[model samples]
Target: VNSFSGYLKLTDNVYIKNADIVEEAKKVKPTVVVNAANVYLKHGGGVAGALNKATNNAMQVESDDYIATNGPLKVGGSCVLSGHNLAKHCLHVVGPNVNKGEDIQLLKSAYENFNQHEVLLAPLLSAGIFGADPIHSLRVCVDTVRTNVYLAVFDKNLYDKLVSSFL
Candidate 1:
């Protein structure tokens, strides 16, 4: 079967706000599309780490076939984790969240692995894993990566709903 029965899109300029990667891919009507995603705040994503093991879980969505690349990319490779699972043509980005939340140390680990030159960032609005109240989390992510960022303030409603999943 087709892993998650959803849509995925491949774009050269990096998917931006209002982009439902799946739906957009449908519009492009490519044979396949891939996504590299990370629910940094959700359980199992190693967001909080051993220090905050009480809330952390091992249920991360990272996988191999979930993501892939188009021939367009000059230097192509698959992410080792969940980014590979979100798309057939696009890879989900697994950026680490930081500040105004738990597990800052673990976030440091996440930062360590980040490639400053090649990373693209989205302006995670309505807050990230913290909940609707902590919009600051998304802001910090934007500020932290602003030097090399592609900010996209996505739908707050969907972002809120996703945050609810963690609560």
Candidate 2:
């Protein structure tokens, strides 16, 4: 249950942690880390921004190439950048934009269609910059493919709330 850090073990292998998502990526070196981005592949803000910075802009180049060939991505679709800066792979998914009154169902559909890896480091799916509620977003993240999932957060208060609520 990761009781010492107050991390909640939601399912058999799904965990909720309060830590810098990038730092955790560096530490865990998971098989892949997911990035929430737009169809344009613009990662200028939020977790996508942090991922770009952490990978030293390598993801941007990959993302550029991806967009060049694949064109814009649909909300429920995703793409991958292999052997990037931190993790072995980076999976980019176009999540719903909260300001646009985007449907949460799109977020769930994205997760449902996500590629499964042995171990994954991800945020609360579309919750943060995508504007979904933590609890609901988390449910989607945790529900995907039964992979080993680490759902991370940058805020301690939010982590505490999630742990208490779920535990």
Candidate 3:
């Protein structure tokens, strides 16, 4: 059995890793990793920015292509970018901003949009810059995606706390 160091299993396949997501991605080598971003796909803040930095901003060009074809990305919508640093593709999903109603529903939609079976790493939706509770966002993802979700948690304290509570 392949064991993930510094990771806690949340379900059969879902896990929470208390480590640098970009770094861990290099080791796990998931097919795709989801980045939470705004409709503009600016990659200016939060996890999206970090992902953009990790991939040398390759995701921005793909997101631009998506924008050119489809009007500004909608909440719950996703775009796939190839040649990322670790994962072969980066799934950029538009998520809710602070004060947006039905954040959970939008988050659920984001999780549902991607259909690939290979590992898909994601961050806590609607949390962080979006102002949603981390625990609540995690719950929504766990309920919606079940065993298919892999969460990247940068905060070791928060990771430890969630691991204890969920496991």
Q: Which candidate is the best by lDDT?
A: 2
| Quality of model 2 by C-alpha lDDT | 0.76
Candidate 1 global lDDT: 0.31
Better of 1 and 2 by TM-score: 2
- lDDT score at residue 85, model 2, on the 0-100 scale: 57
Please write out the lDDT profile of model 3 over residues 57-143, one tens digit for every residue.
Answer: 777887788778887877887777673676877777776776666455677786665544456777877777877778877776777
* Per-model TM values vs. the true structure: 0.33, 0.88, 0.85
Q: Indicate the residue-level lDDT of 127 in model 3.
A: 72
List where candidate 3 sits over 4 angstroms from the true fold.
1-5, 99-102, 114-116
Compared with the true structure, all predictions reach lDDT values of 0.31, 0.76, 0.74
After aligning candidate 3 to the native by TM-score, how far in Å is the CA of 85 from where it should be? 1.9
Name the best candidate (by TM-score): 2
Better of 2 and 3 by TM-score: 2
Q: Considering summed lDDT, which 10 consecutive residues are worst modelled in model 1?
A: 69-78
Candidate 1 C-alpha lDDT tens digits along 1-167: 12222212213222234444333333443322322224432223222221123212221322212223222211112233222222222233333334344343233223222233344333332234423333443334433432233333346575544344321
Evaluated at residue 64, the lDDT of candidate 1 is 19
- For model 1, the stretches where C-alpha displacement exceeds 4 angstroms are 1-115, 119-134, 156-167
